[PDB]
Structure formats: structure tokens, C-alpha cells
Write a protein that binds this ligand. Structure first.
Ligand code: NI
Length: 341
């Protein structure tokens, strides 16, 4: 059944709750972003109102075939009335189209639901600065002090420098980047840009990218693989067997592959810096795992919450085990005692 942490009290609303059938008492289903664990259950047969961003709305229509009459896109940073309740959508700094949602309950309670987010100090100057938030439904993916990772900017700088050096030394090297969802487009776009190439990809993935309102996108991507020296493949194909295979397919146009696997966290983050990362190499194939995250580090999460000073925190991630739930509740109490709310 629908868990309590997907329901908004005092409303008939649910958030990211599409896999339970009809939720008794739900008048509006919000969708924070287009990632499969969140939209799971949506299809062309859905006949309830879906509220989301413009970009998420484009993907629901074009990829899932949800009918236009049930898709309700809202602009960001704008007070909107839904079924009698004032709501605002804010940028979540996650993947394209990902939002946080502010609910203003008739009784005066204000609730923030972060969806999936990467906390950033820029959020401290949004419409969140303007009133008190009582309850926070928080993305706790990386809520443990071991989770450090570099800035997105530092990671893209490393990738750009690595690729440009490799291809300039060997003009017959291919760059491959893995993907299994929307998000982390900066990785492959930044590399293609420094190399003066477009990125080549399958027809299904091109279709997905043409939903994202990225400026000048026609100038940056293509379905013609042969004209391109940055290829995107399924994350599953990013290994030596999949890459050797792929290399055969290019007809001896290339003699070397340099591949990137944008992971979340991996335990080499506890010991190694970005300047010190090394690949796995078999022959003329090298694979780099780069820690490009679209979720809060522990310190970014802690800063956001200590800024916001909520009265109650409801975790939405890692909630399945008593050990995880207890650990999280300990950090929340530390933060509150250190900051004095
Ligand atoms: Ni996500």
C-alpha cells in the first residue's frame, strides 16, 4: 500500500505514487521528475490529473504516451492554485525538469517536498527564503558523513581535460559515455564540445533528449554515429566485452576507446581526490568511473537543513530498514542541537 511518506496531509495529494493503483482519496498526483522509480506505473491508460514541470510533461507525452488532457504542466517559481491549495514548483538541481514542491495548507502549515535534489546555497535565495517551512520531505540518499564528493564543475573539468589530451595524442581514439536515464547530460555535452564533435546516439535516446528544452540542442546531438567521435551507449554496454564489441562495429575507423561511467558515489571517494583518479585498462580500451552526482553530499544536505530549520523531517530514501531509519534520525538530532532550532 501507499506509504505515508508519499502522502501530503490536509490535501488529497500524493507525490511520486503511481504504482499502487487508485490511491483512495487522491484528487491530484504530482510527479517530481522523470526517473523510473518515481514514475513507475504511469502509461497511456492513466486518467487522473498529473501535475509536473513542462519538461517532465514533454517526456510523459512523448515517451510514455500519457494523453494530453491528463498532463498539467506548471511554470517554475510561480504561485499556482491546484484543487484549492497554493503550490510552487522550484528547481531541484537534479536532472532536467526535476522539481521540489512547496505546499501551503489551508490551516497555515507549509510543507516542502524536495523530490530528488542536490542541495545548493542558491536555494537559500529562492522563494524558500520568504516564509517558514514546518515539515520537510527530504531526499536522504547520501545521509551519512562518508559521502563526500567533488563539485560538478571540478568533475567536468577533469573529464574535458582527459578527453582532449587523449584524442589530441591519438586522432583515431573514440570517446564513449554510458547512460540509462535522463541526467548528467553535461558530461557528454562538455566532452563533445571540446572535441568539436556532436554526440551520437540511438534514435530512442535522441528522442528523449529532444524533450528537454536544452538551448541549441540541434547543434549538439545527432543520430549519425559515423560522423561523431563521442558515442552514447547503455550503461550496461560500458565494460570490456561491450566496448570491444562496439569497436568492431565502427569498421576500423577507430583503434582506441576511452570510456566514462558517471557513477554516484563509490568507496574510492574516501581515499582518492579527483586529480588522482585512474582508469581500468585492457588493451586499447580504458574505462574511467567519475563521481558525477545529482544528489546532495552529506555536508550539502546538512547545510540546507540547518538553514531551513524545519520542525519535522520525513525521509523519502533509505527508509526500508530500521538501522537506516535510526541512523538518519540521529543525524537530524545532531544537526538541530548544533544549530539551535
Ligand atoms: Ni532521481
Amino acid at each position: 500500500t501507499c506509504p505515508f511518506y508519499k502522502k501530503i496531509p490536509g490535501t488529497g495529494f500524493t507525490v511520486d505514487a503511481f504504482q499502487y493503483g487508485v490511491v483512495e482519496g487522491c484528487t491530484a498526483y504530482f510527479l517530481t521528475h522523470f526517473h523510473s522509480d518515481h514514475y513507475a506505473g504511469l502509461s497511456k491508460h492513466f486518467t487522473f490529473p498529473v501535475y509536473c514541470s513542462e519538461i517532465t510533461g514533454n517526456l510523459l507525452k512523448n515517451k510514455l504516451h500519457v494523453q494530453e488532457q491528463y498532463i498539467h504542466p506548471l511554470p517554475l517559481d510561480t504561485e499556482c492554485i491546484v484543487n484549492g491549495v497554493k503550490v510552487v514548483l522550484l528547481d531541484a538541481n537534479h536532472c532536467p525538469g526535476a522539481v521540489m514542491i512547496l505546499f501551503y495548507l489551508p490551516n497555515g502549515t507549509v510543507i516542502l517536498h524536495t523530490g530528488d535534489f542536490r542541495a545548493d546555497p542558491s536555494m537559500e535565495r529562492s522563494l524558500l527564503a520568504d516564509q517558514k517551512v514546518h515539515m520537510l520531505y527530504l531526499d536522504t540518499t547520501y545521509c551519512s558523513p562518508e559521502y563526500t564528493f567533488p563539485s560538478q564543475q571540478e568533475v567536468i573539468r577533469f573529464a574535458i581535460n582527459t578527453a582532449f589530451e587523449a584524442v589530441t595524442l591519438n586522432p583515431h581514439a573514440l570517446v564513449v559515455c554510458g547512460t540509462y536515464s535522463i541526467g548528467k547530460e553535461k558530461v557528454f555535452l562538455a566532452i563533445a564540445d571540446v572535441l568539436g564533435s556532436k554526440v551520437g546516439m540511438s534514435q530512442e535516446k535522441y528522442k528523449t533528449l529532444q524533450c528537454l528544452n536544452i538551448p541549441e540542442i540541434n547543434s549538439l546531438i545527432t543520430t549519425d554515429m559515423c560522423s561523431s567521435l563521442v558515442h552514447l551507449l547503455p550503461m550496461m554496454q560500458i565494460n570490456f566485452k561491450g566496448l570491444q564489441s562496439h569497436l568492431k562495429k565502427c569498421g576500423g575507423k577507430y583503434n582506441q576507446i576511452l570510456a566514462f561511467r558517471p557513477t554516484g558515489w563509490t568507496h574510492s571517494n574516501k581515499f582518492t581526490r579527483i586529480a588522482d583518479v585512474i582508469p581500468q585498462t585492457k588493451g586499447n580500451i580504458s574505462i574511467y568511473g567519475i563521481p558525477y552526482s545529482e544528489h546532495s553530499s552529506y555536508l550539502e544536505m546538512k547545510r540546507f537543513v540547518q538553514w531551513l530549520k524545519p520542525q519535522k523531517i520525513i525521509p523519502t530514501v533509505n527508509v526500508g530498514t530500521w538501522k537506516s531509519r535510526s541512523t538518519m534520525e540521529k543525524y537530524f538530532r545532531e544537526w538541530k542541537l548544533e544549530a539551535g532550532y
